[PDB]
Amino acid sequence: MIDYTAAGFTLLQGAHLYAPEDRGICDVLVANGKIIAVASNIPSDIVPNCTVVDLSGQILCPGFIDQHVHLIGGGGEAGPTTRTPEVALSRLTEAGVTSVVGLLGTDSISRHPESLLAKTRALNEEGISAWMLTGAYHVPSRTITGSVEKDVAIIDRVIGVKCAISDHRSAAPDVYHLANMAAESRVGGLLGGKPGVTVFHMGDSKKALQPIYDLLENCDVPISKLLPTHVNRNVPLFEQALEFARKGGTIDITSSIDEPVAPAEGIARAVQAGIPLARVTLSSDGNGSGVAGFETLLETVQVLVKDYDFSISDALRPLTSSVAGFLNLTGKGEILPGNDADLLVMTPELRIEQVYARGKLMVKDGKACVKGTFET
Amino acid sequence: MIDYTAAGFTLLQGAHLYAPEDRGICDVLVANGKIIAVASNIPSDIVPNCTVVDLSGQILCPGFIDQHVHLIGGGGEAGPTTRTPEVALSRLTEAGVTSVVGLLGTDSISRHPESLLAKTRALNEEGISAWMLTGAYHVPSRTITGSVEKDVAIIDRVIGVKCAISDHRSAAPDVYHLANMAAESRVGGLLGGKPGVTVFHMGDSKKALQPIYDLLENCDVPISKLLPTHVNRNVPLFEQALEFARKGGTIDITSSIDEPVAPAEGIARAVQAGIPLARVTLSSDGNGSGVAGFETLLETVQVLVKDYDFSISDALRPLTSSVAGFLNLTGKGEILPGNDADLLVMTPELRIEQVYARGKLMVKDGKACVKGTFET
Amino acid sequence: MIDYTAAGFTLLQGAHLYAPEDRGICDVLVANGKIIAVASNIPSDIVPNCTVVDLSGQILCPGFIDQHVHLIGGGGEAGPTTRTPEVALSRLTEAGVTSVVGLLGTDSISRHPESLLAKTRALNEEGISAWMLTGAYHVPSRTITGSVEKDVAIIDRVIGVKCAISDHRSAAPDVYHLANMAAESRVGGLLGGKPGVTVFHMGDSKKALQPIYDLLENCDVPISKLLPTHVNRNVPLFEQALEFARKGGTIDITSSIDEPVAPAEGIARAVQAGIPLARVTLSSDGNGSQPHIGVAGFETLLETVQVLVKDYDFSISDALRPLTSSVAGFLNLTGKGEILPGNDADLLVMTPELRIEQVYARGKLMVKDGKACVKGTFET
Amino acid sequence: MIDYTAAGFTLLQGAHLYAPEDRGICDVLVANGKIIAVASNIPSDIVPNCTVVDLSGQILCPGFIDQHVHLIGGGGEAGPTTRTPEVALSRLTEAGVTSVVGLLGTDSISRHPESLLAKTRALNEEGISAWMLTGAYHVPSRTITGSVEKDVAIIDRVIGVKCAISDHRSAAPDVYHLANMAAESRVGGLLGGKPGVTVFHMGDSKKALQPIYDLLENCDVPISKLLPTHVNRNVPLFEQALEFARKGGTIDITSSIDEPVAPAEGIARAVQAGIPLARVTLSSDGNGSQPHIGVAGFETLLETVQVLVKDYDFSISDALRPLTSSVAGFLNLTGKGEILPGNDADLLVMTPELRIEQVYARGKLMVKDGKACVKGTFET
Ligand SMILES: [Cl-]
Ligand SMILES: [Cl-]
Ligand SMILES: [Cl-]
Ligand SMILES: [Cl-]
Ligand SMILES: [Cl-]
Ligand SMILES: [Cl-]
Ligand SMILES: [Mg+2]
Ligand SMILES: [Mg+2]
Ligand code: NA
Ligand code: NA
Ligand SMILES: [Zn+2]
Ligand SMILES: [Zn+2]
Ligand SMILES: [Zn+2]
Ligand SMILES: [Zn+2]
Ligand SMILES: [Zn+2]
Ligand SMILES: [Zn+2]
Ligand SMILES: [Zn+2]
Ligand SMILES: [Zn+2]
């Protein structure tokens, strides 16, 4: 018998597929970590050495893309005992996260972009998909190569730059500094084939988004590259964010911020305000500092469907297609032929059962079956 | 018989000469790459070992000076596969270009001033005349010696600095940065004997020339050193450029931009607006990124004469005397004794037949007869 | 009618397979740029929407790996007019090259690692597989990040460092500098998952391999990381290179140097000296300047294979090693140089007389009927 | 009446020509600063608007090339009052100098390469031909761009590097530093189209040429790029210099050092040692300090020529070599040091007893009746 095991053929059968678009009962054929066919009634024997998975009665959807994770650990605002630990592979996978964007925050003294890059690469070797943002709250940014533009252009895993504004922990950046940094990210992305975004950690200053508007007034970076995050942290800020989105920007809601605007609520409000889901993303801020977890992501989807009247498809957008679109994550956020085989298998009540990353089974019966090198 | 071949005597006979000024049927005597006599009926035997060229029925004019060429290649805005190739000698010559100013654009990460300088020097060794601008779209400028002023002052082939404004690919420069950069170019030019200009790649921002006006308000660089290019890229910008020119500035129209203001049209408009041709230049933006060619230069002259009622002399100004004047290109842009023997021989319909660079035959029957070292 | 095209199922049937190991007639099935099965008589219907290719009467082998190419151009030793142009995709592919390592030479003033990296990435995007070496002839190395160790560790496409020794164009490096550079590449390789090698452009100094020996005496970089290149440039050097190989080193023969030691001849002499083919590699030094001045091409690669088989008593299988498996092994090029399930679908289809017919790179047809059917973005 | 003046047609007629090769009576025609014909009996009417000069009874030879001049001034070894002033154009031209190489000495604190480059360019503008060396006595070299290699490659007027060895004013350079500096100049020369030489100011240490030999042992720079200067400063050094020359090196004798080995004497001894004149050069070390303290002048250049012919049995043709053809050859000074069609019109008109009458630089009359008729912008 010929050995075709190198293909890793996997047929996911009979689940109710949400691509996120509802596709009804539809099958998914995978080979080499890629989605090679998406159709009803794919023959269990279409390909050899095929692992057939009966997903009857289950739900199938794209894996989550969490664009705001402190991969190497964060914290440190109350001294060194508050530096959090690096993230564990299984914590991500059990949470349904198959793609991540790592970043740094307040501390860029004991935290380094080179370290973040190494962890990013470890995660990719481990089976998931990971990118990072150069910089940290500090402006001017602390980079790997000496320039934001050069980092985004030449460090493969770097997709944009991080910063903090309107926050008591900011570097008190002026418009010129912010604009130049964003412009550099933009240009570096073009060169490197990266989205070249600028992510803004928002604080509670009354100024809110003003720095972003000033920046817009002082440069030609498209508004589509400017991402304010933690927008639900305060009402007045949230309200500004809706306008920002109405103007063409994309806003990022933090699943780990419960009050004063809860995540689901935030997403619900956006839609009420007439903002298309494509301009609304949800991130966890996981692994920050207590120690932020990833459970709030799935919880958010559940709540949206359960308590807010969102369809399953719509509820998924902000964690899947909306993210992939904002970051130009080719091959992610959608179940289509040619895309990466990053999928979630859930109960009808939206409880995760299985997770596939790049076609590999990572979670089974809701428990990780692939663990990081040093996990216990 | 005595050998006088070292003189390279060449007598160009009987053509209708446009210096660009119309000189009627007039001859041109060349020696050692220089124009040594310009008169009617120069005796075919005035000098020995003389190559006599019968230009009866043909047109004779100065070679083109294209001040905006991506000599080493450009592009790269859609990833690395979009980096264009370096320019080929014959592409320039066949297009009637005998003098070039090379520059960099968006990408100053994988493109370097030292590389540009080497190509500039190769072209000079090859037979034409080439200069360059330090910097690139990026501001603050990336230079060879660490300072714009020092580059313009001490790198022989460097004549000014390049930058980008009002463009989604700019570095979001502030007035101080732009003004200081221009001031440095200005000062460096005085010291080095260079025009010390500042060239502005214009984008489509509604702000248009504002940065230039701000700059003027914040420094004492003469307006005659500030060159906005791509002025025909947008109407509103174009309209501002005419005012700028009316105020004493010189504006550069791109022959490779067809809409919304075509090159010829642009030049025609300028004259309608009462701007002297001396303050209007035309450049190709050749070798940029598809892959920009040089055919539009001559096409522009043809169209101006053919469809716009310009005399041959006037049509030539923006590619010859106007450029030479703006850049203080001593010995270029005009057929006069003492000037360099850079000439074009054309049909009455303005089709190029022969090209001479520094007195050497480069193109014959419209085809290059001198090719770069690695040309096929 | 279910659409399975995303898989890019391709079945190469009936050729005589050299993996490079001789496997006789055997089929190869490809999906998504990967070799998914290698066996005789694979059913044509085994997979849906499958492009079946009849290679009966032909030869199927791994694509070549050229570890020494001046991707962005080189030259410049006789002034700026001698700076060669960047390499065209089609010249590589039509020459059988599916994997390449780019590097710089004498000129590191008008040439920069950042430029080279961009070029490497373009080639990858166009369909082939490309890596590069940091540094250039100049020592201390001119790098991207400020340290050789750092470049190797953090720049994904960098796999080692380049240098020049025993040559009139060298930077007169001393042992310390050389050792330090070599150890940094080694360590950056470990951290980054790269081979972390040091490539030594050899010149004609009478000192030949001496600097390498001195280096080994002054550090602990494994001999398996030190690659002398252009070893066939002179007899005494060549002969020293055989000794070095006997001691556990790997030697790189330049296909474009035909005297005084021809490439096939050098390879045969290495074999006659007791060196296993795994320690002998062949590279082109393509795209550098060739004295009227020209650009060195890549045809000598395939010609060396032809010559070995025709005139030096080599089996096809062995003749292929120095361009395929030996290189991948030396550079730890995972998934390259061997036709095995799981490896990348980088294959050459040739006639029985070893002339290229088709070339597949990462499962994509790049050459058909001996002509590039896939070309660089701006290819002329 | 057609105007042909732009050509600057000039015809030097009837002199006895030393190209430096003896050519007997022969005419030289000039156009645009170039020599366009060299022959006997060139017709006076051959070209229009021609300035015909009757040089009957006179001598015509190439203009001198002084490769060692402190253009911006030097000195400073006895405090700031000993810093000499910049060189005046007229002092160079009246001394027969049409091509010069500027350099720095002991002081690289109050003296900078950027200053020197500006001065070099001024001289070019004024009508002569000037180049310079980067660095100074200090090693590591203090450069314009940050690297010796880079300066030589990219600064048009830089053609090599200067250093000091075996001298109480040296920077105590070790072999590595010296070798590295030398190899960078070499390589920058290749890229830039410069000779890429290294000039060694020699002192009186007993070590003499040792550092050069050590350098050769530690690198691959060709011996033809290493120029020891001031070789006649001491006997033992001079004698070592003869050996070095015998081995293929070129040696530079200083015209301003009259003991213990006089310049003509040193030149004659070089010849007597079997060294071809092509490997012997003479330079002034002009504009440095001369101990009451003064500025060293350039008259010793012509005097050495006079002395060789009068007292050392030299032909005029040979006596000229070390100031013309040997220098141009050593520095690859294209178009200089020889009267041949195509070369620059840099000529000296002298009496039969070798006293300067006229000087043409790039075809321009700079000296007439022995007096500068062309002077520096601010000349006093
Ligand atoms: Cl705050
Ligand atoms: Cl882990
Ligand atoms: Cl724009
Ligand atoms: Cl070319
Ligand atoms: Cl290509
Ligand atoms: Cl003066
Ligand atoms: Mg065997
Ligand atoms: Mg003789
Ligand atoms: Na690896
Ligand atoms: Na030269
Ligand atoms: Zn934050
Ligand atoms: Zn955070
Ligand atoms: Zn532009
Ligand atoms: Zn441009
Ligand atoms: Zn080499
Ligand atoms: Zn090479
Ligand atoms: Zn000295
Ligand atoms: Zn001196």
Side-chain angles (χ1 to χ4, degrees), chain A, chain B, chain C residues 1-291 293-380, chain D residues 1-291 293-380:
Chain A
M1 339 150 83
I2 295 153
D3 182 340
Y4 301 97
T5 69
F9 289 128
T10 302
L11 177 66
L12 299 174
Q13 236 189 22
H16 186 152
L17 164 74
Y18 298 89
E21 299 71 12
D22 182 349
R23 299 294 194 229
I25 310 303
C26 194
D27 301 337
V28 183
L29 189 59
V30 172
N32 303 294
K34 309 262 159 142
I35 292 160
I36 59 149
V38 185
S40 275
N41 313 306
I42 294 178
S44 67
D45 70 352
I46 192 57
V47 299
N49 279 138
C50 193
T51 298
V52 188
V53 190
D54 175 34
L55 301 184
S56 47
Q58 320 304 309
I59 286 170
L60 184 69
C61 73
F64 306 152
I65 305 171
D66 181 358
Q67 66 172 327
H68 191 127
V69 189
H70 295 266
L71 294 183
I72 60 167
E77 310 168 23
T81 62
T82 70
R83 297 171 69 256
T84 58
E86 73 182 274
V87 300
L89 172 68
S90 68
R91 275 318 147 257
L92 290 170
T93 63
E94 284 169 354
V97 177
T98 51
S99 280
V100 68
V101 184
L103 41 67
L104 303 183
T106 308
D107 182 2
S108 52
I109 297 286
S110 86
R111 301 303 191 171
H112 303 81
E114 290 89 355
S115 299
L116 178 58
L117 173 70
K119 178 71 170 172
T120 292
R121 288 163 163 174
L123 294 163
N124 291 328
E125 281 187 39
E126 301 264 29
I128 60 165
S129 304
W131 295 265
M132 62 172 277
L133 297 179
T134 190
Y137 286 15
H138 196 281
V139 177
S141 324
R142 293 175 169 143
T143 60
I144 302 174
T145 72
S147 113
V148 165
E149 187 172 293
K150 198 168 160 173
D151 275 23
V152 188
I154 81 165
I155 306 294
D156 68 326
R157 302 325 283 200
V158 171
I159 67 176
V161 65
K162 166 71 175 292
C163 78
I165 52 161
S166 300
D167 182 281
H168 68 102
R169 295 151 298 180
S170 78
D174 66 3
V175 66
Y176 172 65
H177 287 84
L178 285 180
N180 167 81
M181 175 189 65
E184 281 214 355
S185 185
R186 196 283 203 280
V187 179
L190 292 176
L191 301 185
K194 319 290 178 63
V197 299
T198 300
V199 175
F200 301 84
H201 156 98
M202 305 300 311
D204 288 332
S205 158
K206 291 195 125 49
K207 288 155 173 253
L209 305 190
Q210 202 52 52
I212 304 190
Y213 289 118
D214 295 342
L215 180 153
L216 281 162
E217 238 315 273
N218 286 261
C219 75
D220 288 274
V221 176
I223 193 183
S224 69
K225 300 299 197 189
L226 315 182
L227 184 86
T229 188
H230 309 321
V231 303
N232 47 328
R233 77 172 313 121
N234 81 69
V235 178
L237 163 59
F238 183 80
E239 297 289 341
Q240 291 201 9
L242 294 185
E243 331 179 300
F244 175 84
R246 266 194 317 273
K247 299 163 161 198
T250 298
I251 65 189
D252 179 69
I253 295 177
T254 308
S255 75
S256 58
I257 292 176
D258 272 344
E259 147 255 341
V261 178
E265 172 189 0
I267 294 175
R269 301 155 67 125
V271 171
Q272 291 160 20
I275 289 148
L277 286 176
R279 294 210 306 279
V280 182
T281 62
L282 181 77
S283 68
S284 64
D285 201 9
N287 215 60
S289 158
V291 201
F294 302 89
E295 68 285 343
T296 56
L297 301 168
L298 175 61
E299 291 176 346
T300 295
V301 172
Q302 292 175 344
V303 165
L304 278 166
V305 179
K306 172 148 166 237
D307 298 326
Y308 289 79
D309 294 309
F310 273 58
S311 54
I312 287 170
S313 299
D314 282 339
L316 288 166
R317 302 190 149 103
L319 278 184
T320 59
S321 54
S322 299
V323 201
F326 179 76
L327 297 175
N328 209 17
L329 297 187
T330 299
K332 306 302 203 187
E334 310 212 25
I335 298 166
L336 295 160
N339 278 9
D340 290 351
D342 292 342
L343 320 139
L344 308 190
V345 177
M346 316 196 265
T347 65
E349 299 67 55
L350 310 189
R351 262 63 171 172
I352 293 178
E353 293 176 288
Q354 314 193 150
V355 183
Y356 292 84
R358 296 160 35 204
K360 164 148 123 290
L361 186 64
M362 310 287 290
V363 177
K364 207 198 2 182
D365 303 331
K367 300 121 58 201
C369 61
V370 175
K371 296 207 191 117
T373 303
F374 300 111
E375 288 201 70
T376 43
Chain B
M1 339 150 83
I2 295 153
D3 182 340
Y4 301 97
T5 69
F9 289 128
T10 302
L11 177 66
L12 299 174
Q13 236 189 22
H16 186 152
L17 164 74
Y18 298 89
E21 299 71 12
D22 182 349
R23 299 294 194 229
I25 310 303
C26 194
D27 301 337
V28 183
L29 189 59
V30 172
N32 303 294
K34 309 262 159 142
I35 292 160
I36 59 149
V38 185
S40 275
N41 313 306
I42 294 178
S44 67
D45 70 352
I46 192 57
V47 299
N49 279 138
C50 193
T51 298
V52 188
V53 190
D54 175 34
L55 301 184
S56 47
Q58 320 304 309
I59 286 170
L60 184 69
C61 73
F64 306 152
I65 305 171
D66 181 358
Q67 66 172 327
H68 191 127
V69 189
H70 295 266
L71 294 183
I72 60 167
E77 310 168 23
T81 62
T82 70
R83 297 171 69 256
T84 58
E86 73 182 274
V87 300
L89 172 68
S90 68
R91 275 318 147 257
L92 290 170
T93 63
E94 284 169 354
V97 177
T98 51
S99 280
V100 68
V101 184
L103 41 67
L104 303 183
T106 308
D107 182 2
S108 52
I109 297 286
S110 86
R111 301 303 191 171
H112 303 81
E114 290 89 355
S115 299
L116 178 58
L117 173 70
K119 178 71 170 172
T120 292
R121 288 163 163 174
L123 294 163
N124 291 328
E125 281 187 39
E126 301 264 29
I128 60 165
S129 304
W131 295 265
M132 62 172 277
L133 297 179
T134 190
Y137 286 15
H138 196 281
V139 177
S141 324
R142 293 175 169 143
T143 60
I144 302 174
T145 72
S147 113
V148 165
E149 187 172 293
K150 198 168 160 173
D151 275 23
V152 188
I154 81 165
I155 306 294
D156 68 326
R157 302 325 283 200
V158 171
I159 67 176
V161 65
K162 166 71 175 292
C163 78
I165 52 161
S166 300
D167 182 281
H168 68 102
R169 295 151 298 180
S170 78
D174 66 3
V175 66
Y176 172 65
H177 287 84
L178 285 180
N180 167 81
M181 175 189 65
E184 281 214 355
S185 185
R186 196 283 203 280
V187 179
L190 292 176
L191 301 185
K194 319 290 178 63
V197 299
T198 300
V199 175
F200 301 84
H201 156 98
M202 305 300 311
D204 288 332
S205 158
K206 291 195 125 49
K207 288 155 173 253
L209 305 190
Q210 202 52 52
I212 304 190
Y213 289 118
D214 295 342
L215 180 153
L216 281 162
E217 238 315 273
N218 286 261
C219 75
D220 288 274
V221 176
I223 193 183
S224 69
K225 300 299 197 189
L226 315 182
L227 184 86
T229 188
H230 309 321
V231 303
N232 47 328
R233 77 172 313 121
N234 81 69
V235 178
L237 163 59
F238 183 80
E239 297 289 341
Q240 291 201 9
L242 294 185
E243 331 179 300
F244 175 84
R246 266 194 317 273
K247 299 163 161 198
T250 298
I251 65 189
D252 179 69
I253 295 177
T254 308
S255 75
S256 58
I257 292 176
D258 272 344
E259 147 255 341
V261 178
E265 172 189 0
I267 294 175
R269 301 155 67 125
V271 171
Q272 291 160 20
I275 289 148
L277 286 176
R279 294 210 306 279
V280 182
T281 62
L282 181 77
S283 68
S284 64
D285 201 9
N287 215 60
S289 158
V291 201
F294 302 89
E295 68 285 343
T296 56
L297 301 168
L298 175 61
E299 291 176 346
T300 295
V301 172
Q302 292 175 344
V303 165
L304 278 166
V305 179
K306 172 148 166 237
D307 298 326
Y308 289 79
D309 294 309
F310 273 58
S311 54
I312 287 170
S313 299
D314 282 339
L316 288 166
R317 302 190 149 103
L319 278 184
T320 59
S321 54
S322 299
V323 201
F326 179 76
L327 297 175
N328 209 17
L329 297 187
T330 299
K332 306 302 203 187
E334 310 212 25
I335 298 166
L336 295 160
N339 278 9
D340 290 351
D342 292 342
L343 320 139
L344 308 190
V345 177
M346 316 196 265
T347 65
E349 299 67 55
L350 310 189
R351 262 63 171 172
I352 293 178
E353 293 176 288
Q354 314 193 150
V355 183
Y356 292 84
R358 296 160 35 204
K360 164 148 123 290
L361 186 64
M362 310 287 290
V363 177
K364 207 198 2 182
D365 303 331
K367 300 121 58 201
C369 61
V370 175
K371 296 207 191 117
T373 303
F374 300 111
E375 288 201 70
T376 43
Chain C
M1 281 300 258
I2 299 155
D3 175 12
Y4 306 100
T5 75
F9 286 136
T10 301
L11 172 64
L12 310 179
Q13 241 169 27
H16 187 149
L17 177 63
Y18 296 86
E21 297 77 13
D22 189 354
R23 312 278 203 222
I25 305 308
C26 178
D27 298 344
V28 169
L29 181 69
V30 170
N32 309 111
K34 292 282 151 87
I35 292 168
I36 64 169
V38 181
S40 276
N41 312 309
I42 298 171
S44 350
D45 64 346
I46 200 49
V47 295
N49 312 144
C50 188
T51 286
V52 186
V53 188
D54 177 10
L55 305 187
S56 46
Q58 324 302 124
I59 278 185
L60 187 61
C61 75
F64 301 153
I65 304 173
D66 188 353
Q67 71 171 322
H68 190 127
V69 183
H70 295 263
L71 304 172
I72 58 163
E77 315 164 16
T81 69
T82 62
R83 302 162 72 251
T84 56
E86 81 191 284
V87 155
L89 174 72
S90 72
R91 301 285 80 71
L92 292 165
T93 67
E94 283 173 353
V97 178
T98 47
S99 284
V100 66
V101 183
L103 41 67
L104 301 179
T106 308
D107 185 359
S108 57
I109 297 301
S110 79
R111 308 293 191 178
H112 310 79
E114 293 90 347
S115 297
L116 177 65
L117 177 60
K119 180 66 171 184
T120 293
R121 306 172 149 162
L123 294 169
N124 287 329
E125 247 181 75
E126 307 270 19
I128 66 166
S129 298
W131 294 266
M132 61 173 278
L133 301 180
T134 192
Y137 283 16
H138 196 273
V139 174
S141 312
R142 288 172 174 142
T143 63
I144 297 181
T145 70
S147 106
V148 168
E149 187 172 292
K150 193 172 189 184
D151 278 18
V152 186
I154 84 163
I155 304 287
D156 77 320
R157 300 325 281 196
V158 175
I159 62 174
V161 63
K162 171 68 179 298
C163 74
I165 58 171
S166 293
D167 183 282
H168 74 262
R169 296 162 286 191
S170 81
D174 57 1
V175 67
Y176 173 64
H177 279 99
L178 278 181
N180 173 70
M181 174 191 69
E184 282 205 1
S185 179
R186 192 286 198 285
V187 172
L190 299 175
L191 305 181
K194 322 290 174 64
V197 304
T198 298
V199 172
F200 302 82
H201 150 101
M202 305 300 304
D204 290 315
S205 168
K206 264 109 132 195
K207 261 98 175 236
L209 299 185
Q210 201 59 43
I212 304 182
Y213 285 114
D214 296 337
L215 184 148
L216 282 169
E217 256 311 296
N218 286 264
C219 71
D220 291 276
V221 175
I223 190 165
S224 66
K225 303 302 190 171
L226 316 168
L227 188 79
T229 192
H230 320 315
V231 310
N232 47 320
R233 61 181 320 128
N234 80 66
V235 187
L237 164 67
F238 183 76
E239 290 184 335
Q240 276 200 29
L242 299 180
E243 271 307 298
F244 177 77
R246 292 193 64 144
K247 296 164 160 272
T250 290
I251 55 171
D252 188 59
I253 289 170
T254 307
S255 77
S256 66
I257 292 183
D258 71 338
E259 298 143 26
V261 176
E265 169 194 10
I267 287 163
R269 283 164 71 165
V271 166
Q272 299 172 169
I275 303 147
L277 288 168
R279 293 202 313 276
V280 181
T281 61
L282 179 76
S283 61
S284 69
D285 206 2
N287 214 49
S289 61
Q290 216 185 171
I293 324 148
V295 192
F298 303 90
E299 70 284 344
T300 56
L301 295 178
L302 178 70
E303 304 175 347
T304 297
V305 172
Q306 286 167 357
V307 170
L308 284 165
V309 175
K310 197 193 212 93
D311 303 322
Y312 289 81
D313 205 38
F314 273 64
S315 56
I316 294 174
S317 181
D318 285 342
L320 290 167
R321 287 183 190 279
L323 288 188
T324 57
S325 63
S326 304
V327 203
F330 181 75
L331 302 178
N332 314 353
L333 295 186
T334 308
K336 307 304 199 173
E338 299 163 290
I339 295 160
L340 291 173
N343 282 5
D344 295 341
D346 289 348
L347 320 137
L348 307 188
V349 176
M350 301 190 179
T351 67
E353 299 71 28
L354 314 166
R355 302 209 167 83
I356 300 177
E357 292 171 297
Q358 311 197 128
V359 179
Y360 294 82
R362 297 143 54 203
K364 185 221 258 128
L365 178 67
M366 314 284 293
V367 174
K368 203 179 202 162
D369 310 309
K371 286 125 25 199
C373 58
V374 177
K375 294 215 179 160
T377 291
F378 305 106
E379 280 193 69
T380 8
Chain D
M1 281 300 258
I2 299 155
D3 175 12
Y4 306 100
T5 75
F9 286 136
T10 301
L11 172 64
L12 310 179
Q13 241 169 27
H16 187 149
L17 177 63
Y18 296 86
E21 297 77 13
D22 189 354
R23 312 278 203 222
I25 305 308
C26 178
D27 298 344
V28 169
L29 181 69
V30 170
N32 309 111
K34 292 282 151 87
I35 292 168
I36 64 169
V38 181
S40 276
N41 312 309
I42 298 171
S44 350
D45 64 346
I46 200 49
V47 295
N49 312 144
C50 188
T51 286
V52 186
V53 188
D54 177 10
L55 305 187
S56 46
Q58 324 302 124
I59 278 185
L60 187 61
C61 75
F64 301 153
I65 304 173
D66 188 353
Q67 71 171 322
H68 190 127
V69 183
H70 295 263
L71 304 172
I72 58 163
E77 315 164 16
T81 69
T82 62
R83 302 162 72 251
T84 56
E86 81 191 284
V87 155
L89 174 72
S90 72
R91 301 285 80 71
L92 292 165
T93 67
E94 283 173 353
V97 178
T98 47
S99 284
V100 66
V101 183
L103 41 67
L104 301 179
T106 308
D107 185 359
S108 57
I109 297 301
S110 79
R111 308 293 191 178
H112 310 79
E114 293 90 347
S115 297
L116 177 65
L117 177 60
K119 180 66 171 184
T120 293
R121 306 172 149 162
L123 294 169
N124 287 329
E125 247 181 75
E126 307 270 19
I128 66 166
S129 298
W131 294 266
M132 61 173 278
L133 301 180
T134 192
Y137 283 16
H138 196 273
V139 174
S141 312
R142 288 172 174 142
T143 63
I144 297 181
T145 70
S147 106
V148 168
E149 187 172 292
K150 193 172 189 184
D151 278 18
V152 186
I154 84 163
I155 304 287
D156 77 320
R157 300 325 281 196
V158 175
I159 62 174
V161 63
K162 171 68 179 298
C163 74
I165 58 171
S166 293
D167 183 282
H168 74 262
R169 296 162 286 191
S170 81
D174 57 1
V175 67
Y176 173 64
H177 279 99
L178 278 181
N180 173 70
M181 174 191 69
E184 282 205 1
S185 179
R186 192 286 198 285
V187 172
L190 299 175
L191 305 181
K194 322 290 174 64
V197 304
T198 298
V199 172
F200 302 82
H201 150 101
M202 305 300 304
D204 290 315
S205 168
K206 264 109 132 195
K207 261 98 175 236
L209 299 185
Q210 201 59 43
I212 304 182
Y213 285 114
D214 296 337
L215 184 148
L216 282 169
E217 256 311 296
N218 286 264
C219 71
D220 291 276
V221 175
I223 190 165
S224 66
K225 303 302 190 171
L226 316 168
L227 188 79
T229 192
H230 320 315
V231 310
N232 47 320
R233 61 181 320 128
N234 80 66
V235 187
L237 164 67
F238 183 76
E239 290 184 335
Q240 276 200 29
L242 299 180
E243 271 307 298
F244 177 77
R246 292 193 64 144
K247 296 164 160 272
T250 290
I251 55 171
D252 188 59
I253 289 170
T254 307
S255 77
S256 66
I257 292 183
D258 71 338
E259 298 143 26
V261 176
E265 169 194 10
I267 287 163
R269 283 164 71 165
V271 166
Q272 299 172 169
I275 303 147
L277 288 168
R279 293 202 313 276
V280 181
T281 61
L282 179 76
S283 61
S284 69
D285 206 2
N287 214 49
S289 61
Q290 216 185 171
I293 324 148
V295 192
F298 303 90
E299 70 284 344
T300 56
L301 295 178
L302 178 70
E303 304 175 347
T304 297
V305 172
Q306 286 167 357
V307 170
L308 284 165
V309 175
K310 197 193 212 93
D311 303 322
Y312 289 81
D313 205 38
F314 273 64
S315 56
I316 294 174
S317 181
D318 285 342
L320 290 167
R321 287 183 190 279
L323 288 188
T324 57
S325 63
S326 304
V327 203
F330 181 75
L331 302 178
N332 314 353
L333 295 186
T334 308
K336 307 304 199 173
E338 299 163 290
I339 295 160
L340 291 173
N343 282 5
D344 295 341
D346 289 348
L347 320 137
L348 307 188
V349 176
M350 301 190 179
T351 67
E353 299 71 28
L354 314 166
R355 302 209 167 83
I356 300 177
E357 292 171 297
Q358 311 197 128
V359 179
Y360 294 82
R362 297 143 54 203
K364 185 221 258 128
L365 178 67
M366 314 284 293
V367 174
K368 203 179 202 162
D369 310 309
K371 286 125 25 199
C373 58
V374 177
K375 294 215 179 160
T377 291
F378 305 106
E379 280 193 69
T380 8

